[PDB]
């Protein structure tokens, strides 16, 4: 019951499945094509703070997955390596065959802590993961994704780091890394051009930590 | 610019518990982007002795204690309250001593970006100490 | 364990002179994870010292701190009668503390 999208010399109709179309010829399988779409091109937040929160935890769930043939290219990609609090990793190593998604602008790699209730971690809207050429339904661990759909039809990076804690629930907080021992205070307002100038400001300018402790940096709130 | 004020002692008998506090300002909270901090105490006559800190949740939150102390007291947070506890069970009168809290925190350099704060593995704030007596 | 013991237990020297004390350590430690602290009656420990010979601020520079291994010396080139304090080590070993047994400086 998966519909089609078919392409005219009009507009992209949807295929039925109760009215025949004569006309619309299906000369071979290279006619038929598996597009994935990212979610950003429908204006969904994608800072940190805001994307985690759409994302959660089940057991007794299974995960899936599908392939594609052609899909966008990311402006934001997200990898995660979150583990428990007593230290065992929440995310399950990624299977053969998975490989992470290959057009990625920034990447927003996330290492941190928090509560992981489930087995798995599952789209909340029933959106999938998008790795190389294969949407699923979970998150894998250390394996770059880009949030999206899945189109079916007929057709005639500048790595960012960021910690957290509390990963999994829904008061987490999140800092911007920029060196082992300076960190800067994350916020929703902030975009990946504006990290990356921060980092060049601060990195460029030596206000980082020199002693032994961490340096944690808050932004002037204008 | 950071400050932490110790509170709940005074006199417990030997075989009881009891649990201090420390509440303090001045910093960032305590809790996360915030240095751990310690319990270290002095009976009068003697140096000081650590007994633990409760690190940063950050830092993941774990408690290490010295060996004195180990199996006997307790080391924890209230988050986001800004306030250290230590909760001393199994008490002896050989633990009557100066309770003292202390925070590896001060303030770090500013730019025209934002402002910042240090935290470190030592000791930059040091409380009063309030006095714990342990006596039949 | 990595146990520290000072020496000499009292000094005694005229302000104006010089002063130095040292610690031992049971176990050889990096330089990034010592400190000294002076101590009043009547006030908590200041930091004075730390990393070895890294200054706390808000401490004179006639306080220099120095040495490796087990071995760790406070030299003050002048001991002030302000400085007449009781002197302690410190040592973070990347994760349990350490307290000297504390130093009396007289004139």
């Known amino acids: 019951s998966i519909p089609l999208g078919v392409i005219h010399n009009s507009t992209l109709q949807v295929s039925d499945v109760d009215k025949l179309v004569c006309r619309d010829k299906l000369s071979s399988t290279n006619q038929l094509r598996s597009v994935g779409l990212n979610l950003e091109g429908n204006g969904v937040a994608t800072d940190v703070p805001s994307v985690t929160k759409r994302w959660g935890f089940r057991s007794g769930v299974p995960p899936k997955v599908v392939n594609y043939e052609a899909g966008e290219w990311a402006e934001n990609c997200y990898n995660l390596e979150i583990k428990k609090p007593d230290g065992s990793e929440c995310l399950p190593a990624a299977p053969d065959g998975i490989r992470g998604f290959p057009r990625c602008r920034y990447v927003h790699k996330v290492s941190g802590t928090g509560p992981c209730a489930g087995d798995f971690a599952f789209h909340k809207e029933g959106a999938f993961f998008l790795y190389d050429r294969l949407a699923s339904t979970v998150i894998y661990r250390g394996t770059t994704f880009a949030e999206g759909v899945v189109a079916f039809l007929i057709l005639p990076s500048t790595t960012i780091r960021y910690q957290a804690t509390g990963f999994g629930t829904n008061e987490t907080e999140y800092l911007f890394e920029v060196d082992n021992l300076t960190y800067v205070q994350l916020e929703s307002r902030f975009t990946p051009q504006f990290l990356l100038q921060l980092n060049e400001t601060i990195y460029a300018s030596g206000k980082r930590s020199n002693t032994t402790g961490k340096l944690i940096w808050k932004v002037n709130p204008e | 610019e950071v400050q932490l004020v110790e509170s709940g002692g005074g006199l417990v008998k030997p075989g009881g518990s009891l649990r201090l506090s420390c509440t303090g300002s001045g910093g960032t909270g305590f809790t996360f982007k915030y240095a751990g901090m310690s319990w270290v105490r002095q009976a009068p006559g003697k140096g000081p002795e650590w007994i633990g800190r409760?690190?940063?949740?950050?830092?993941?939150?774990?408690?290490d204690y010295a060996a004195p102390v180990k199996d006997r007291f307790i080391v924890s947070r209230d988050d986001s309250r800004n306030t250290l506890y230590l909760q001393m069970n199994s008490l002896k009168t050989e633990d009557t001593a100066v309770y003292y809290c202390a925070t590896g925190s001060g303030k770090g350099p500013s730019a025209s970006f934002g402002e910042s704060y240090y935290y470190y593995d030592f000791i930059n704030v040091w409380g009063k100490g309030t006095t714990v007596t342990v006596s039949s | 364990e990595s146990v520290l013991t000072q020496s000499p237990g009292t000094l005694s020297l005229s302000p104006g002179e010089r002063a130095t004390l040292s610690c031992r350590a049971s176990?050889?430690?990096?330089?990034?994870?010592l400190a000294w602290y002076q101590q009043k009656p009547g006030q908590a420990p200041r930091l004075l010292i730390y990393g070895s010979s890294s200054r706390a601020t808000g401490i004179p520079d006639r306080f220099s701190g120095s040495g490796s291994g087990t071995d760790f010396t406070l030299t003050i080139s002048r001991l002030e009668p302000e400085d007449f304090a009781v002197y302690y080590c410190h040592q973070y070993e990347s994760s349990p503390w350490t307290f000297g047994q504390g130093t009396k400086v007289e004139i």
């Open positions: 176990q050889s430690i990096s330089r990034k994870y």
């Open positions: 409760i690190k940063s949740r950050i830092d993941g939150g774990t408690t």
